[PDB]
Design a protein around this ligand. Sequence first.
Ligand SMILES: Nc1ncnc2c1ncn2[C@@H]1O[C@H](COP(=O)(O)OP(=O)(O)O)[C@@H](O)[C@H]1O
Ligand SMILES: Nc1ncnc2c1ncn2[C@@H]1O[C@H](COP(=O)(O)OP(=O)(O)O)[C@@H](O)[C@H]1O
Ligand code: BEF
Ligand code: BEF
Ligand SMILES: [Mg+2]
Ligand SMILES: [Mg+2]
Lengths: 417, 417, 112, 48
Amino acid sequence: MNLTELKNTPVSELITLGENMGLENLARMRKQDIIFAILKQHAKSGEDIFGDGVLEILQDGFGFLRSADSSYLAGPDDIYVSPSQIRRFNLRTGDTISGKIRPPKEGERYFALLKVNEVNFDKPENARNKILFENLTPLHANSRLRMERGNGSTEDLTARVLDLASPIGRGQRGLIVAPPKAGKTMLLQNIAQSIAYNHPDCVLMVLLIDERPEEVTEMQRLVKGEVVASTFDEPASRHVQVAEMVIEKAKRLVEHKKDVIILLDSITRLARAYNTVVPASGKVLTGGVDANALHRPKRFFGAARNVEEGGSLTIIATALIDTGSKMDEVIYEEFKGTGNMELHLSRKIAEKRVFPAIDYNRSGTRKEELLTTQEELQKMWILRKIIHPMGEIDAMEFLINKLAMTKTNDDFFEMMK
Amino acid sequence: MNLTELKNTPVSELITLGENMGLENLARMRKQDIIFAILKQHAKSGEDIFGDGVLEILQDGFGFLRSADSSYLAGPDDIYVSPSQIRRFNLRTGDTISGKIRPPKEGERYFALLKVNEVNFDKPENARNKILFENLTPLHANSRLRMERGNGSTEDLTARVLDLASPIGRGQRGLIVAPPKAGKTMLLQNIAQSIAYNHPDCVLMVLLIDERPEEVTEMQRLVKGEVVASTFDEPASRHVQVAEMVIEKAKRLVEHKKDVIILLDSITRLARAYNTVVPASGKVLTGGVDANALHRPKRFFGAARNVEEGGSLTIIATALIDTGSKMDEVIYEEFKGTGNMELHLSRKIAEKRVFPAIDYNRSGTRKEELLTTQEELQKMWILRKIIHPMGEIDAMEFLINKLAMTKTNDDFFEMMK
Amino acid sequence: KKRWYVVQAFSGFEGRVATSLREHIKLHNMEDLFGEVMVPTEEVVEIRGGQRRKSERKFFPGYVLVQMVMNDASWHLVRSVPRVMGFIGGTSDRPAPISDKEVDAIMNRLQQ
Amino acid sequence: PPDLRPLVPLDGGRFATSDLNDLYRRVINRNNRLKRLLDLAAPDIIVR
DNA sequence: CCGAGCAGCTACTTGTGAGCGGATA
DNA sequence: TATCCGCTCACAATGCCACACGCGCTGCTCGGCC
RNA sequence: CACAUUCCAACCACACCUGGCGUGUGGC
Ligand SMILES: Nc1ncnc2c1ncn2[C@@H]1O[C@H](COP(=O)(O)OP(=O)(O)O)[C@@H](O)[C@H]1O
Ligand SMILES: Nc1ncnc2c1ncn2[C@@H]1O[C@H](COP(=O)(O)OP(=O)(O)O)[C@@H](O)[C@H]1O
Ligand code: BEF
Ligand code: BEF
Ligand SMILES: [Mg+2]
Ligand SMILES: [Mg+2]
């Protein structure tokens, strides 16, 4: 009996399972109470339980193990852990842990962690032998993360133009600058699909902050990877909470020498949240943002880097512009020169229903010479020189046509000669 | 056991060293806690410690010795100093000090300075015999700081055009005016390399305010000199703090009759910081900047001058323009006529991928007659008259070609006849 | 033989009494009779969190048991320094030291 | 009984307490310290 | 690191009665 | 070895009434299943 | 179906205060 085995299957399986186990009507309870009562009644038969979850530090000293079913929040099935385990086995926020668990004992209300078996997909014996995040030596991206599928499907174009507009690498810092209703969602979905297909070794995670529930439920079953989200049903406290959860998970995983890739949507919602949960410090500028209200977005974004010993943390967030409110603009303003790679989507191109609507020369990547080879770089320069004198819209159409004629970009490059 | 000996070596050496010394797992702590625990356990064996660092004055009276590892910030390994030492040996902000130190004694938490041995690379006996900064008589720059390497490498062109576009001298006031992504970083790196090669006697320092961590880590191992930086991971309080630290270090060093050269990148970030940490005074103009929010940038920049008794302070900062926000513009506005030397880089030239993209006639140096000789000045006038009727871009290409044919600028000048 | 006798001090001043007795030992140059403080307050138990993750080098009873050789001069020296209110041990005034089992026990508490 | 122990809110943050309160608190403190020392297998002389 | 409660910085009384050695046969 | 003598410790020493006042500073240690 | 209570025109319920202890002084 593992926690994830009830964590991932839908509510219907839980219903039939509890109705089989001779339960009070479980349809009256929440998913977390469903799993809680089922694990209760299972342990009441005399089984030792196993479980897993991501740790969250509390200010009282003890920690709590959350799951991705609750999007890393407080729930009845969260596993309590004493501070002394956090001491001995060197635990902290982001450390995903799986091991021996039991239901809350007599008078308690949360599961207890008995025996640690896996710390961030590692032996708990070597978990103490880890390197911190701030002591890391960041670098530029050297390894290329090819986004092209090569099968030549209809939507795959929106990926190939990636390899032609703004290259990506392990540990890249990317900002999506686009007005609302321009095509950021399909772009992000294709990004996630291409990464999960071509690079299944690196862990893939996605942030949805203040989004619509339909987008969340479509995302959680379109990508091959564990996704976390937070709609507008919930206060910004939930958004900042899941923000620490995901960022510390990525930090601990990259400390374990793993390549993490986070796709955040959108950074404007996260900035609004961080501004509304931060108290007033008397420092107000245009838009209604506190001066220290942006320190947390700056932290979350500067978390991205390329480690030298092994592993990297790529952070690709989308920002919203042209939303009519100057506050949003100011956000994008401080995020203007902070990223070394940008995807600029103009609404003028998306207005003609020609996708993908990407502004070529307004997009680019800093220090992209270390991500690609010499032939590829020269061909990129030639393509930029060919596309520069023309405008945005039908020039993007020209790129789309030249991409649709060839199967992969090798034929396109050879034809460009 | 000196503080710098653990200050400069990477984290890996600290790991193996502490693992040799029979330590608790030091991989769980920060660099500062690493050095702190190692120095603790070393003194626990009975050794008197030596240390060094730059002093920072606090308003409570006492001072704290910071290092360049923390970029001159508060840390567990900062050395506490009593105000009475600051009285007797005449200490102040910027005074770098090395001498006898001990770990914090019983109940304390910061190192104590026992015995002063070196004040700004001088005997503490003569340290009281110093001249202040504001009592200095500034002048123009007379000594020429030749930036040309003379070896004729491929990138060295970006330095030789320096000697052809805007001359530099000891104590010069230079402003780099360029839009984002035009080539300021490579220019600054070549400046630092050329100065560290041709003038290894003058101390070289560089300011990175609200930059990317990859640029910081590439800078700290490309130049032959101690660098300080501050990325966007940190609030503007850190930026202003390191600003006083570096400016007072330069001030004390030039008071000690030393030639200081500071390369600041970028002054726009520093102006944003100074504006966001300054409280509102009810005086707001276009852009969202307070009227007194610019007094601190004005102070930091006017710190540059050429001293007559000996030594000088050259300050070369880069400003950002064409960033879409008028606020930045206003900053550059008040920094329009304040500098006597400017490097104007236009994005129109950098758009063709021809480097260096320098606007010749829009650049210049005031009172440059005292920096160069008569032959050199006449040849500069002739070159300016030849380049003036032509445009920016291919005229810069013409200069680049005429520079690439010759080995040093002597052959170029002789050919221009 | 350098035995490990136990000494109690003023409530809170344990480390201060430890440094005072060390300075007293280094004062009368009697290092051949004493060892070190062996302050058993290796209780790095801390409370971490939002901007507050410092450590606590405290949380132990007020005992500063010192390794030393029992003698008249040694006892009078360790008692002459003030704030030494407690000299534990069932005796008139000359107690018995601790055994090696508890020595290794407190050593394990030191290492853990 | 608690109210049988004199403890009244005096002027300000201070409270007028009884002498029995300090006794009971010191007793509880030393009892808890003894219970802690018995679990850590303290030396015989220390628990004595 | 923050907050809350708590600790270190003697002798002009005299008399009465009971108890604990103690020393003497 | 019983037994008187000398040294040591616990216990006591109106009652009422009226007024006024007080227990600090630095330092140390413990406080916490959402 | 059963157990168990029912949140609002005057007003009943929502009241009123430092001998903890010591010291100093004075009176009978
Ligand atoms: N690669 C693609 N293939 C097909 N459609 C796309 C692609 N990229 C973007 N789109 C279009 O963009 C639209 C995205 O809608 P919406 O989510 O409102 O925009 P945003 O992502 O800016 O919120 C979809 O209607 C979709 O048709
Ligand atoms: N001298 C040079 N030789 C080759 N490439 C250069 C040179 N100078 C600049 N570049 C190109 O310009 C880019 C510089 O990026 P960056 O340092 O971010 O510029 P900035 O700091 O002005 O934004 C690099 O990708 C590099 O390829
Ligand atoms: F709907 Be999009 F995210 F603005
Ligand atoms: F360094 Be770039 F000009 F942001
Ligand atoms: Mg969308
Ligand atoms: Mg730069």
